[PDB]
Amino acid sequence: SNFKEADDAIHYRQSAFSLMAHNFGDMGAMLKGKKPFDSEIFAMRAQNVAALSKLPLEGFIPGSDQGETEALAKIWTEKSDFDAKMVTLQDNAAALLLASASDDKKLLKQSFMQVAKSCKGCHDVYKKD
């Protein structure tokens, strides 16, 4: 068992998502002009998102749908699809990290959008309203 209690796995996955969101949202703000675009900071943010996208899945242990969590129970009865959506987030995030090595803003925006689709798509199905 990777966690002592269900409440440690919830906090772990919640912390992971939160930190990913902080780094993802900064890339969104730079791409929308809410804050100046910076190639080096954007690349750091993309690296952080790629790495942090590999953390939360470990936290979705059996029985951790009870408690102070927004995870829906259907996650575990459809864990194969949930797992697939998490792998595709990782893949998309690795692609955004690659796009940050290029100077093509089309590419950055496109791979960013694909990653944003992954956050959104999973929340729509597997996160409480």
Interface contacts to ligand HEC, rule CB under 6 A: 10, 13-14, 17-18, 20-21, 24, 49, 69-71, 82, 85-86, 89, 115, 118-119, 122-123, 126-127
Which of ligand HEC, a copy of itself, none interacts with 115 (beta carbon under 5 to 8 A by kind)? ligand HEC
42 near 29, Cβ under 8 Å? no
Q: Say which residues have a Cβ less than 8 Å from residue 35's Cβ, sequence separation at least 6.
A: 26, 29
Backbone angles phi, psi at 77, to 5 degrees: -80, -5
The maximal CA–CA distance of the chain, rounded, in angstroms, is 46
Sign of CA pseudo-dihedral 8, 63, 2, 124: negative
Stretches 5-13, 76-84, 88-96, 112-120: which one binds a copy of itself (CB under 8 A)? 5-13
119 is in an annotated binding site: yes
Q: Is 54 in the site for a copy of itself (CB under 8 A)?
A: yes
From 10, 12, 111, 126, residue interacting with a copy of itself (rule: CB under 8 A): 12
What's the DSSP call for residue 127? B
- Residue at token pair 């953390």: 55
Interface with a copy of itself, residue 48, by CB under 8 A:
yes
Q: Is 11 marked within a binding site?
A: no
**Site of interaction with a copy of itself (CB under 8 A):** 2, 8, 11-12, 15-16, 18-19, 22, 26, 44, 47-48, 51-52, 54-55
